[PDB]
Amino acid sequence: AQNPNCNIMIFHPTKEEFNDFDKYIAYMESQGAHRAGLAKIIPPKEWKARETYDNISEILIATPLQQVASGRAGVFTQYHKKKKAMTVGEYRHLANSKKYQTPPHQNFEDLERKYWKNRIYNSPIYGADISGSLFDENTKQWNLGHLGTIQDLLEKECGVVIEGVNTPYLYFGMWKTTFAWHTEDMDLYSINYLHLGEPKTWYVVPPEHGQRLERLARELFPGSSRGCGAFLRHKVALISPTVLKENGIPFNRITQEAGEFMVTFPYGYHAGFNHGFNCAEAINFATPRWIDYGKMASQCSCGEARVTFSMDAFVRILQPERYDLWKRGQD
Ligand SMILES: O=C(O)CNC(=O)C(=O)O
Ligand SMILES: [Mg+2]
Ligand code: NI
Ligand SMILES: [Zn+2]
């Protein structure tokens, strides 16, 4: 069995290997990459996402989100308070202000220490979940707006044609902006490209051990667990590496820098934080290997998780017994 310790693997495809996206994912899996839940892909030196970022300041962040924490430093939830619209140029100036900027630090490890010590005492503002793309239309390789759709994959594998669309999302971050512990909708893959700015640190639990994280989360957030049988779908809970180690939960960590891709694999729980002002693009995708994970994915029916239009058909075809209850949650 390849990669039996479930380590995060890093890949350096050549420009020739960068042509065929599906083939390269399958290659990484042949080497055991999926066992970690997360892989890094460094693009060939010849490749670029677009010519420059000199012209992005006029993108609008219609609903910036202030991420307010509750709990203790290593075990907390966050809620999102909506703020007034601002441009990316306005948000970048805010990120660089004395109130929000990255503190002085020695290296990524010192910064990670400071994040876990101090995160709860601040409320950073995240420009998350903005429909759109920064890839040039002429970029032919690993262009996240030109990928094969999940609807087309389901049709190819299973024969059934369904409604729905699959488009990318932009994320503008600042110091301490946080993504809570989660898997993707319907336990899909994700791919994330860091277009510019400061790094993003990731934590990940191997898919074979995801239920150990779920059992810990039920213990640590006991009210939330009584409220919903899949409350990590709410994407509000944080647990630090120190607390995971104290509880014996297998995990790994890695830092993504500008110009690098990360892929998350079906049922790979992940969480993390941004080091300073940055911009990332991400989208969900599927392969043949996903279908069995989609059939078994948990679902929130309490009403909190509220998701996209396109998830209806996935539930309806892959999970017909759950469909009725899940849709009551959505309405
Ligand atoms: O970058 C973020 O805030 C969160 N990203 C992801 O969870 C992802 O790409 O799957
Ligand atoms: Mg602009
Ligand atoms: Ni994710
Ligand atoms: Zn729920």
PDB file of all heavy atoms in Angstrom, residues 181-183 187 214 217-218 221 223-237 267 269 296-307 311 322 326, unseen atoms left out:
ATOM      1  N   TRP A 181     -12.915  23.393  10.797  1.00  0.00           N
ATOM      2  CA  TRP A 181     -12.813  21.969  10.425  1.00  0.00           C
ATOM      3  C   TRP A 181     -13.991  21.530   9.579  1.00  0.00           C
ATOM      4  O   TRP A 181     -15.157  21.654  10.008  1.00  0.00           O
ATOM      5  CB  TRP A 181     -12.719  21.092  11.693  1.00  0.00           C
ATOM      6  CG  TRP A 181     -11.328  21.066  12.305  1.00  0.00           C
ATOM      7  CD1 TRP A 181     -10.876  21.673  13.447  1.00  0.00           C
ATOM      8  CD2 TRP A 181     -10.191  20.398  11.761  1.00  0.00           C
ATOM      9  NE1 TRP A 181      -9.543  21.470  13.642  1.00  0.00           N
ATOM     10  CE2 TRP A 181      -9.068  20.668  12.598  1.00  0.00           C
ATOM     11  CE3 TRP A 181      -9.984  19.636  10.624  1.00  0.00           C
ATOM     12  CZ2 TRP A 181      -7.796  20.157  12.342  1.00  0.00           C
ATOM     13  CZ3 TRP A 181      -8.744  19.116  10.380  1.00  0.00           C
ATOM     14  CH2 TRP A 181      -7.684  19.372  11.201  1.00  0.00           C
ATOM     15  N   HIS A 182     -13.743  20.976   8.400  1.00  0.00           N
ATOM     16  CA  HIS A 182     -14.830  20.522   7.517  1.00  0.00           C
ATOM     17  C   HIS A 182     -14.295  19.551   6.496  1.00  0.00           C
ATOM     18  O   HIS A 182     -13.092  19.523   6.155  1.00  0.00           O
ATOM     19  CB  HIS A 182     -15.510  21.726   6.803  1.00  0.00           C
ATOM     20  CG  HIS A 182     -14.655  22.370   5.764  1.00  0.00           C
ATOM     21  ND1 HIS A 182     -13.592  23.211   6.091  1.00  0.00           N
ATOM     22  CD2 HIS A 182     -14.649  22.314   4.415  1.00  0.00           C
ATOM     23  CE1 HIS A 182     -12.939  23.623   4.988  1.00  0.00           C
ATOM     24  NE2 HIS A 182     -13.570  23.093   3.940  1.00  0.00           N
ATOM     25  N   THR A 183     -15.209  18.745   5.900  1.00  0.00           N
ATOM     26  CA  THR A 183     -15.022  18.150   4.575  1.00  0.00           C
ATOM     27  C   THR A 183     -15.829  18.916   3.561  1.00  0.00           C
ATOM     28  O   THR A 183     -16.664  19.777   3.924  1.00  0.00           O
ATOM     29  CB  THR A 183     -15.363  16.653   4.545  1.00  0.00           C
ATOM     30  OG1 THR A 183     -16.772  16.484   4.834  1.00  0.00           O
ATOM     31  CG2 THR A 183     -14.550  15.880   5.602  1.00  0.00           C
ATOM     32  N   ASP A 187     -18.749  15.320   0.355  1.00  0.00           N
ATOM     33  CA  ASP A 187     -17.372  14.766   0.454  1.00  0.00           C
ATOM     34  C   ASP A 187     -16.660  14.784  -0.905  1.00  0.00           C
ATOM     35  O   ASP A 187     -15.866  13.913  -1.218  1.00  0.00           O
ATOM     36  CB  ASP A 187     -17.368  13.414   1.144  1.00  0.00           C
ATOM     37  CG  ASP A 187     -17.840  13.508   2.603  1.00  0.00           C
ATOM     38  OD1 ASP A 187     -17.861  14.629   3.145  1.00  0.00           O
ATOM     39  OD2 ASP A 187     -18.191  12.438   3.195  1.00  0.00           O
ATOM     40  N   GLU A 214     -14.499  13.319  14.250  1.00  0.00           N
ATOM     41  CA  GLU A 214     -15.942  13.514  14.554  1.00  0.00           C
ATOM     42  C   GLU A 214     -16.244  13.153  16.017  1.00  0.00           C
ATOM     43  O   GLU A 214     -16.992  13.917  16.681  1.00  0.00           O
ATOM     44  CB  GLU A 214     -16.836  12.721  13.610  1.00  0.00           C
ATOM     45  CG  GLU A 214     -16.751  13.137  12.138  1.00  0.00           C
ATOM     46  CD  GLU A 214     -17.446  12.263  11.178  1.00  0.00           C
ATOM     47  OE1 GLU A 214     -17.885  11.143  11.559  1.00  0.00           O
ATOM     48  OE2 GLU A 214     -17.509  12.603   9.976  1.00  0.00           O
ATOM     49  N   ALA A 217     -14.934  15.878  18.217  1.00  0.00           N
ATOM     50  CA  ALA A 217     -15.754  17.087  18.092  1.00  0.00           C
ATOM     51  C   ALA A 217     -17.053  16.953  18.905  1.00  0.00           C
ATOM     52  O   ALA A 217     -17.486  17.941  19.533  1.00  0.00           O
ATOM     53  CB  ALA A 217     -16.014  17.372  16.650  1.00  0.00           C
ATOM     54  N   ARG A 218     -17.663  15.782  18.854  1.00  0.00           N
ATOM     55  CA  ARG A 218     -18.919  15.601  19.673  1.00  0.00           C
ATOM     56  C   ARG A 218     -18.610  15.797  21.149  1.00  0.00           C
ATOM     57  O   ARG A 218     -19.433  16.422  21.864  1.00  0.00           O
ATOM     58  CB  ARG A 218     -19.569  14.244  19.380  1.00  0.00           C
ATOM     59  CG  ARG A 218     -20.139  14.096  17.989  1.00  0.00           C
ATOM     60  CD  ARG A 218     -20.980  12.801  17.872  1.00  0.00           C
ATOM     61  NE  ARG A 218     -20.243  11.578  18.160  1.00  0.00           N
ATOM     62  CZ  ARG A 218     -19.571  10.849  17.263  1.00  0.00           C
ATOM     63  NH1 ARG A 218     -19.604  11.162  15.988  1.00  0.00           N
ATOM     64  NH2 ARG A 218     -18.926   9.762  17.663  1.00  0.00           N
ATOM     65  N   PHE A 221     -17.803  19.802  21.748  1.00  0.00           N
ATOM     66  CA  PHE A 221     -18.900  20.720  21.430  1.00  0.00           C
ATOM     67  C   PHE A 221     -20.221  19.999  21.675  1.00  0.00           C
ATOM     68  O   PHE A 221     -21.009  19.677  20.763  1.00  0.00           O
ATOM     69  CB  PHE A 221     -18.819  21.216  19.973  1.00  0.00           C
ATOM     70  CG  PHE A 221     -17.544  21.896  19.651  1.00  0.00           C
ATOM     71  CD1 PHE A 221     -16.514  21.174  19.005  1.00  0.00           C
ATOM     72  CD2 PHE A 221     -17.233  23.233  19.943  1.00  0.00           C
ATOM     73  CE1 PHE A 221     -15.272  21.764  18.765  1.00  0.00           C
ATOM     74  CE2 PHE A 221     -16.032  23.785  19.647  1.00  0.00           C
ATOM     75  CZ  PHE A 221     -15.027  23.038  19.048  1.00  0.00           C
ATOM     76  N   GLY A 223     -23.269  20.563  23.173  1.00  0.00           N
ATOM     77  CA  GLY A 223     -24.560  21.229  22.753  1.00  0.00           C
ATOM     78  C   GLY A 223     -24.798  21.193  21.245  1.00  0.00           C
ATOM     79  O   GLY A 223     -25.859  20.823  20.732  1.00  0.00           O
ATOM     80  N   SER A 224     -23.731  21.463  20.543  1.00  0.00           N
ATOM     81  CA  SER A 224     -23.822  21.476  19.036  1.00  0.00           C
ATOM     82  C   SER A 224     -24.108  20.058  18.546  1.00  0.00           C
ATOM     83  O   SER A 224     -24.922  19.874  17.604  1.00  0.00           O
ATOM     84  CB  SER A 224     -22.498  21.961  18.510  1.00  0.00           C
ATOM     85  OG  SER A 224     -22.227  23.316  18.781  1.00  0.00           O
ATOM     86  N   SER A 225     -23.522  19.051  19.143  1.00  0.00           N
ATOM     87  CA  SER A 225     -23.697  17.674  18.735  1.00  0.00           C
ATOM     88  C   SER A 225     -25.148  17.209  18.980  1.00  0.00           C
ATOM     89  O   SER A 225     -25.709  16.514  18.144  1.00  0.00           O
ATOM     90  CB  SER A 225     -22.632  16.729  19.368  1.00  0.00           C
ATOM     91  OG  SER A 225     -22.838  15.339  19.036  1.00  0.00           O
ATOM     92  N   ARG A 226     -25.753  17.624  20.110  1.00  0.00           N
ATOM     93  CA  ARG A 226     -27.171  17.304  20.344  1.00  0.00           C
ATOM     94  C   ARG A 226     -28.079  17.982  19.348  1.00  0.00           C
ATOM     95  O   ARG A 226     -29.109  17.419  19.033  1.00  0.00           O
ATOM     96  CB  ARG A 226     -27.582  17.695  21.793  1.00  0.00           C
ATOM     97  CG  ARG A 226     -27.053  16.767  22.833  1.00  0.00           C
ATOM     98  CD  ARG A 226     -27.601  17.130  24.254  1.00  0.00           C
ATOM     99  NE  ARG A 226     -27.037  18.351  24.797  1.00  0.00           N
ATOM    100  CZ  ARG A 226     -25.901  18.458  25.499  1.00  0.00           C
ATOM    101  NH1 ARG A 226     -25.144  17.358  25.737  1.00  0.00           N
ATOM    102  NH2 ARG A 226     -25.563  19.587  26.000  1.00  0.00           N
ATOM    103  N   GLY A 227     -27.720  19.144  18.885  1.00  0.00           N
ATOM    104  CA  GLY A 227     -28.500  19.908  17.904  1.00  0.00           C
ATOM    105  C   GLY A 227     -28.527  19.332  16.519  1.00  0.00           C
ATOM    106  O   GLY A 227     -29.462  19.613  15.744  1.00  0.00           O
ATOM    107  N   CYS A 228     -27.448  18.593  16.140  1.00  0.00           N
ATOM    108  CA  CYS A 228     -27.278  18.155  14.749  1.00  0.00           C
ATOM    109  C   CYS A 228     -26.317  16.981  14.701  1.00  0.00           C
ATOM    110  O   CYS A 228     -25.178  17.078  15.212  1.00  0.00           O
ATOM    111  CB  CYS A 228     -26.846  19.328  13.870  1.00  0.00           C
ATOM    112  SG  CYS A 228     -26.610  18.764  12.141  1.00  0.00           S
ATOM    113  N   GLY A 229     -26.697  15.944  13.962  1.00  0.00           N
ATOM    114  CA  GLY A 229     -25.888  14.727  13.826  1.00  0.00           C
ATOM    115  C   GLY A 229     -24.692  14.882  12.877  1.00  0.00           C
ATOM    116  O   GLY A 229     -23.892  13.949  12.803  1.00  0.00           O
ATOM    117  N   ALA A 230     -24.612  16.028  12.208  1.00  0.00           N
ATOM    118  CA  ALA A 230     -23.455  16.346  11.306  1.00  0.00           C
ATOM    119  C   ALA A 230     -23.061  17.822  11.420  1.00  0.00           C
ATOM    120  O   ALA A 230     -22.899  18.561  10.488  1.00  0.00           O
ATOM    121  CB  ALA A 230     -23.851  16.007   9.830  1.00  0.00           C
ATOM    122  N   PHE A 231     -22.918  18.330  12.691  1.00  0.00           N
ATOM    123  CA  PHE A 231     -22.685  19.732  12.903  1.00  0.00           C
ATOM    124  C   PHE A 231     -21.380  20.357  12.371  1.00  0.00           C
ATOM    125  O   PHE A 231     -21.317  21.515  12.189  1.00  0.00           O
ATOM    126  CB  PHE A 231     -22.855  20.146  14.403  1.00  0.00           C
ATOM    127  CG  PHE A 231     -21.646  19.751  15.263  1.00  0.00           C
ATOM    128  CD1 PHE A 231     -20.647  20.639  15.500  1.00  0.00           C
ATOM    129  CD2 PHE A 231     -21.614  18.535  15.773  1.00  0.00           C
ATOM    130  CE1 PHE A 231     -19.526  20.247  16.303  1.00  0.00           C
ATOM    131  CE2 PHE A 231     -20.511  18.106  16.552  1.00  0.00           C
ATOM    132  CZ  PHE A 231     -19.504  18.992  16.782  1.00  0.00           C
ATOM    133  N   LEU A 232     -20.404  19.438  12.066  1.00  0.00           N
ATOM    134  CA  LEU A 232     -19.192  20.016  11.382  1.00  0.00           C
ATOM    135  C   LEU A 232     -19.513  20.554   9.972  1.00  0.00           C
ATOM    136  O   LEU A 232     -18.787  21.473   9.552  1.00  0.00           O
ATOM    137  CB  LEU A 232     -18.049  18.971  11.379  1.00  0.00           C
ATOM    138  CG  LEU A 232     -17.464  18.593  12.742  1.00  0.00           C
ATOM    139  CD1 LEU A 232     -16.450  17.523  12.585  1.00  0.00           C
ATOM    140  CD2 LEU A 232     -16.884  19.780  13.426  1.00  0.00           C
ATOM    141  N   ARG A 233     -20.647  20.139   9.405  1.00  0.00           N
ATOM    142  CA  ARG A 233     -21.181  20.750   8.167  1.00  0.00           C
ATOM    143  C   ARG A 233     -21.493  22.200   8.321  1.00  0.00           C
ATOM    144  O   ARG A 233     -21.573  22.943   7.346  1.00  0.00           O
ATOM    145  CB  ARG A 233     -22.466  19.971   7.687  1.00  0.00           C
ATOM    146  CG  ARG A 233     -22.436  18.461   7.234  1.00  0.00           C
ATOM    147  CD  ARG A 233     -21.831  18.385   5.883  1.00  0.00           C
ATOM    148  NE  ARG A 233     -21.525  17.019   5.525  1.00  0.00           N
ATOM    149  CZ  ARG A 233     -20.549  16.727   4.601  1.00  0.00           C
ATOM    150  NH1 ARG A 233     -19.773  17.637   4.119  1.00  0.00           N
ATOM    151  NH2 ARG A 233     -20.391  15.480   4.260  1.00  0.00           N
ATOM    152  N   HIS A 234     -21.661  22.710   9.571  1.00  0.00           N
ATOM    153  CA  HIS A 234     -21.902  24.119   9.800  1.00  0.00           C
ATOM    154  C   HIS A 234     -20.697  25.013   9.596  1.00  0.00           C
ATOM    155  O   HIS A 234     -20.760  26.206   9.470  1.00  0.00           O
ATOM    156  CB  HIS A 234     -22.487  24.390  11.206  1.00  0.00           C
ATOM    157  CG  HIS A 234     -23.695  23.589  11.544  1.00  0.00           C
ATOM    158  ND1 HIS A 234     -24.184  23.529  12.830  1.00  0.00           N
ATOM    159  CD2 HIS A 234     -24.503  22.747  10.829  1.00  0.00           C
ATOM    160  CE1 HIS A 234     -25.220  22.702  12.900  1.00  0.00           C
ATOM    161  NE2 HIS A 234     -25.429  22.188  11.674  1.00  0.00           N
ATOM    162  N   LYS A 235     -19.467  24.373   9.620  1.00  0.00           N
ATOM    163  CA  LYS A 235     -18.232  25.044   9.384  1.00  0.00           C
ATOM    164  C   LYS A 235     -17.969  26.203  10.332  1.00  0.00           C
ATOM    165  O   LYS A 235     -17.607  27.290   9.984  1.00  0.00           O
ATOM    166  CB  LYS A 235     -18.078  25.401   7.895  1.00  0.00           C
ATOM    167  CG  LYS A 235     -18.326  24.213   6.995  1.00  0.00           C
ATOM    168  CD  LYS A 235     -17.915  24.359   5.541  1.00  0.00           C
ATOM    169  CE  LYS A 235     -18.525  25.560   4.901  1.00  0.00           C
ATOM    170  NZ  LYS A 235     -18.163  25.466   3.447  1.00  0.00           N
ATOM    171  N   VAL A 236     -18.059  25.894  11.643  1.00  0.00           N
ATOM    172  CA  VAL A 236     -17.826  26.836  12.758  1.00  0.00           C
ATOM    173  C   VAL A 236     -16.871  26.361  13.824  1.00  0.00           C
ATOM    174  O   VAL A 236     -16.535  27.235  14.657  1.00  0.00           O
ATOM    175  CB  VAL A 236     -19.132  27.415  13.343  1.00  0.00           C
ATOM    176  CG1 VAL A 236     -19.999  28.067  12.315  1.00  0.00           C
ATOM    177  CG2 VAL A 236     -19.840  26.379  13.997  1.00  0.00           C
ATOM    178  N   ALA A 237     -16.400  25.142  13.857  1.00  0.00           N
ATOM    179  CA  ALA A 237     -15.623  24.620  14.971  1.00  0.00           C
ATOM    180  C   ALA A 237     -14.157  24.562  14.711  1.00  0.00           C
ATOM    181  O   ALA A 237     -13.717  24.048  13.652  1.00  0.00           O
ATOM    182  CB  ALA A 237     -16.129  23.259  15.338  1.00  0.00           C
ATOM    183  N   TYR A 267     -13.539  13.242   1.876  1.00  0.00           N
ATOM    184  CA  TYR A 267     -13.624  12.932   3.292  1.00  0.00           C
ATOM    185  C   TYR A 267     -12.303  13.257   4.034  1.00  0.00           C
ATOM    186  O   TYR A 267     -12.081  12.765   5.160  1.00  0.00           O
ATOM    187  CB  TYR A 267     -14.144  11.497   3.548  1.00  0.00           C
ATOM    188  CG  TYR A 267     -14.653  11.285   4.990  1.00  0.00           C
ATOM    189  CD1 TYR A 267     -15.680  12.022   5.527  1.00  0.00           C
ATOM    190  CD2 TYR A 267     -14.028  10.304   5.811  1.00  0.00           C
ATOM    191  CE1 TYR A 267     -16.112  11.792   6.829  1.00  0.00           C
ATOM    192  CE2 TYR A 267     -14.447  10.085   7.074  1.00  0.00           C
ATOM    193  CZ  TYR A 267     -15.472  10.849   7.553  1.00  0.00           C
ATOM    194  OH  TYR A 267     -15.882  10.646   8.933  1.00  0.00           O
ATOM    195  N   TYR A 269     -10.864  15.790   6.253  1.00  0.00           N
ATOM    196  CA  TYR A 269     -11.162  16.988   7.101  1.00  0.00           C
ATOM    197  C   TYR A 269     -10.015  17.956   7.074  1.00  0.00           C
ATOM    198  O   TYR A 269      -8.833  17.505   7.254  1.00  0.00           O
ATOM    199  CB  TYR A 269     -11.446  16.552   8.560  1.00  0.00           C
ATOM    200  CG  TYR A 269     -12.884  16.160   8.825  1.00  0.00           C
ATOM    201  CD1 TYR A 269     -13.280  14.849   8.933  1.00  0.00           C
ATOM    202  CD2 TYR A 269     -13.883  17.141   9.011  1.00  0.00           C
ATOM    203  CE1 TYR A 269     -14.636  14.496   9.164  1.00  0.00           C
ATOM    204  CE2 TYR A 269     -15.227  16.788   9.214  1.00  0.00           C
ATOM    205  CZ  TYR A 269     -15.562  15.493   9.270  1.00  0.00           C
ATOM    206  OH  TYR A 269     -16.931  15.119   9.438  1.00  0.00           O
ATOM    207  N   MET A 296     -22.143   7.927   0.564  1.00  0.00           N
ATOM    208  CA  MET A 296     -22.034   7.718   2.021  1.00  0.00           C
ATOM    209  C   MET A 296     -21.900   9.028   2.773  1.00  0.00           C
ATOM    210  O   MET A 296     -21.924   8.951   4.018  1.00  0.00           O
ATOM    211  CB  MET A 296     -20.745   6.898   2.287  1.00  0.00           C
ATOM    212  CG  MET A 296     -20.852   5.453   1.842  1.00  0.00           C
ATOM    213  SD  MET A 296     -19.389   4.446   2.183  1.00  0.00           S
ATOM    214  CE  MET A 296     -17.836   5.300   1.715  1.00  0.00           C
ATOM    215  N   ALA A 297     -21.870  10.219   2.160  1.00  0.00           N
ATOM    216  CA  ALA A 297     -21.612  11.449   2.848  1.00  0.00           C
ATOM    217  C   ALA A 297     -22.712  11.717   3.883  1.00  0.00           C
ATOM    218  O   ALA A 297     -23.923  11.631   3.611  1.00  0.00           O
ATOM    219  CB  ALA A 297     -21.549  12.597   1.851  1.00  0.00           C
ATOM    220  N   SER A 298     -22.298  12.200   5.044  1.00  0.00           N
ATOM    221  CA  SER A 298     -23.243  12.760   6.004  1.00  0.00           C
ATOM    222  C   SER A 298     -23.906  13.950   5.497  1.00  0.00           C
ATOM    223  O   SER A 298     -23.440  14.712   4.592  1.00  0.00           O
ATOM    224  CB  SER A 298     -22.578  13.147   7.308  1.00  0.00           C
ATOM    225  OG  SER A 298     -21.754  14.216   7.091  1.00  0.00           O
ATOM    226  N   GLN A 299     -25.063  14.156   6.122  1.00  0.00           N
ATOM    227  CA  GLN A 299     -25.690  15.349   5.853  1.00  0.00           C
ATOM    228  C   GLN A 299     -26.315  16.106   7.079  1.00  0.00           C
ATOM    229  O   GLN A 299     -26.664  15.426   8.057  1.00  0.00           O
ATOM    230  CB  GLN A 299     -26.898  15.189   4.872  1.00  0.00           C
ATOM    231  CG  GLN A 299     -26.592  14.535   3.511  1.00  0.00           C
ATOM    232  CD  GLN A 299     -25.651  15.294   2.641  1.00  0.00           C
ATOM    233  OE1 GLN A 299     -25.182  16.392   2.973  1.00  0.00           O
ATOM    234  NE2 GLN A 299     -25.151  14.589   1.617  1.00  0.00           N
ATOM    235  N   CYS A 300     -26.229  17.416   7.045  1.00  0.00           N
ATOM    236  CA  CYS A 300     -26.943  18.320   8.012  1.00  0.00           C
ATOM    237  C   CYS A 300     -28.430  18.399   7.438  1.00  0.00           C
ATOM    238  O   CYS A 300     -28.623  18.926   6.296  1.00  0.00           O
ATOM    239  CB  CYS A 300     -26.385  19.713   7.977  1.00  0.00           C
ATOM    240  SG  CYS A 300     -27.392  20.937   8.900  1.00  0.00           S
ATOM    241  N   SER A 301     -29.351  18.062   8.251  1.00  0.00           N
ATOM    242  CA  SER A 301     -30.795  18.360   7.987  1.00  0.00           C
ATOM    243  C   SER A 301     -31.447  19.331   9.015  1.00  0.00           C
ATOM    244  O   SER A 301     -32.690  19.538   8.876  1.00  0.00           O
ATOM    245  CB  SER A 301     -31.553  17.007   7.941  1.00  0.00           C
ATOM    246  OG  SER A 301     -30.799  16.030   7.109  1.00  0.00           O
ATOM    247  N   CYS A 302     -30.642  19.892  10.009  1.00  0.00           N
ATOM    248  CA  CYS A 302     -31.165  20.803  11.071  1.00  0.00           C
ATOM    249  C   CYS A 302     -31.457  22.113  10.515  1.00  0.00           C
ATOM    250  O   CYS A 302     -32.072  22.936  11.211  1.00  0.00           O
ATOM    251  CB  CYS A 302     -30.225  20.984  12.305  1.00  0.00           C
ATOM    252  SG  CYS A 302     -28.746  22.097  12.108  1.00  0.00           S
ATOM    253  N   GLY A 303     -30.963  22.443   9.340  1.00  0.00           N
ATOM    254  CA  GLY A 303     -31.264  23.678   8.714  1.00  0.00           C
ATOM    255  C   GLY A 303     -30.130  24.639   8.702  1.00  0.00           C
ATOM    256  O   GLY A 303     -30.163  25.595   7.930  1.00  0.00           O
ATOM    257  N   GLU A 304     -29.094  24.386   9.515  1.00  0.00           N
ATOM    258  CA  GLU A 304     -28.034  25.382   9.624  1.00  0.00           C
ATOM    259  C   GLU A 304     -27.184  25.421   8.386  1.00  0.00           C
ATOM    260  O   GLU A 304     -26.906  26.521   7.932  1.00  0.00           O
ATOM    261  CB  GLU A 304     -27.155  25.234  10.904  1.00  0.00           C
ATOM    262  CG  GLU A 304     -27.767  25.754  12.179  1.00  0.00           C
ATOM    263  CD  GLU A 304     -28.020  27.243  12.107  1.00  0.00           C
ATOM    264  OE1 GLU A 304     -27.084  28.043  11.804  1.00  0.00           O
ATOM    265  OE2 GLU A 304     -29.185  27.596  12.315  1.00  0.00           O
ATOM    266  N   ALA A 305     -26.807  24.257   7.796  1.00  0.00           N
ATOM    267  CA  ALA A 305     -25.705  24.253   6.783  1.00  0.00           C
ATOM    268  C   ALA A 305     -26.058  24.936   5.455  1.00  0.00           C
ATOM    269  O   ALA A 305     -25.205  25.554   4.818  1.00  0.00           O
ATOM    270  CB  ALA A 305     -25.173  22.854   6.605  1.00  0.00           C
ATOM    271  N   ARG A 306     -27.316  24.920   5.080  1.00  0.00           N
ATOM    272  CA  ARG A 306     -27.785  25.683   3.875  1.00  0.00           C
ATOM    273  C   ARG A 306     -26.710  25.862   2.742  1.00  0.00           C
ATOM    274  O   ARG A 306     -25.718  26.651   2.860  1.00  0.00           O
ATOM    275  CB  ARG A 306     -28.465  27.027   4.274  1.00  0.00           C
ATOM    276  N   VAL A 307     -26.914  25.107   1.665  1.00  0.00           N
ATOM    277  CA  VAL A 307     -25.948  25.028   0.556  1.00  0.00           C
ATOM    278  C   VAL A 307     -26.541  25.295  -0.858  1.00  0.00           C
ATOM    279  O   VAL A 307     -27.744  25.538  -1.043  1.00  0.00           O
ATOM    280  CB  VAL A 307     -25.230  23.648   0.585  1.00  0.00           C
ATOM    281  CG1 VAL A 307     -24.676  23.369   1.990  1.00  0.00           C
ATOM    282  CG2 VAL A 307     -26.201  22.552   0.155  1.00  0.00           C
ATOM    283  N   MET A 311     -26.312  20.986  -5.134  1.00  0.00           N
ATOM    284  CA  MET A 311     -26.244  19.840  -4.217  1.00  0.00           C
ATOM    285  C   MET A 311     -27.541  19.073  -4.201  1.00  0.00           C
ATOM    286  O   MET A 311     -27.492  17.795  -3.962  1.00  0.00           O
ATOM    287  CB  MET A 311     -25.757  20.298  -2.798  1.00  0.00           C
ATOM    288  CG  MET A 311     -24.701  19.350  -2.179  1.00  0.00           C
ATOM    289  SD  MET A 311     -24.545  19.662  -0.469  1.00  0.00           S
ATOM    290  CE  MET A 311     -25.619  18.472   0.313  1.00  0.00           C
ATOM    291  N   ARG A 322     -32.344   9.643   1.918  1.00  0.00           N
ATOM    292  CA  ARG A 322     -32.144  10.848   2.758  1.00  0.00           C
ATOM    293  C   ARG A 322     -32.786  11.979   2.134  1.00  0.00           C
ATOM    294  O   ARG A 322     -32.927  13.026   2.884  1.00  0.00           O
ATOM    295  CB  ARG A 322     -30.620  11.088   2.875  1.00  0.00           C
ATOM    296  CG  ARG A 322     -29.975  10.001   3.745  1.00  0.00           C
ATOM    297  CD  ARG A 322     -28.519  10.227   4.120  1.00  0.00           C
ATOM    298  NE  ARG A 322     -28.031   9.245   5.110  1.00  0.00           N
ATOM    299  CZ  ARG A 322     -26.750   9.051   5.429  1.00  0.00           C
ATOM    300  NH1 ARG A 322     -25.790   9.754   4.848  1.00  0.00           N
ATOM    301  NH2 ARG A 322     -26.430   8.125   6.325  1.00  0.00           N
ATOM    302  N   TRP A 326     -33.425  15.831   4.038  1.00  0.00           N
ATOM    303  CA  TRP A 326     -32.408  16.805   3.772  1.00  0.00           C
ATOM    304  C   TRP A 326     -33.089  18.053   3.158  1.00  0.00           C
ATOM    305  O   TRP A 326     -32.698  19.219   3.484  1.00  0.00           O
ATOM    306  CB  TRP A 326     -31.301  16.254   2.848  1.00  0.00           C
ATOM    307  CG  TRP A 326     -30.359  17.285   2.355  1.00  0.00           C
ATOM    308  CD1 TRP A 326     -29.291  17.795   2.993  1.00  0.00           C
ATOM    309  CD2 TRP A 326     -30.434  17.951   1.118  1.00  0.00           C
ATOM    310  NE1 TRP A 326     -28.692  18.761   2.253  1.00  0.00           N
ATOM    311  CE2 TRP A 326     -29.363  18.869   1.067  1.00  0.00           C
ATOM    312  CE3 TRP A 326     -31.316  17.881   0.045  1.00  0.00           C
ATOM    313  CZ2 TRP A 326     -29.147  19.720  -0.020  1.00  0.00           C
ATOM    314  CZ3 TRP A 326     -31.091  18.694  -1.025  1.00  0.00           C
ATOM    315  CH2 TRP A 326     -30.019  19.632  -1.054  1.00  0.00           C
TER     316      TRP A 326
END
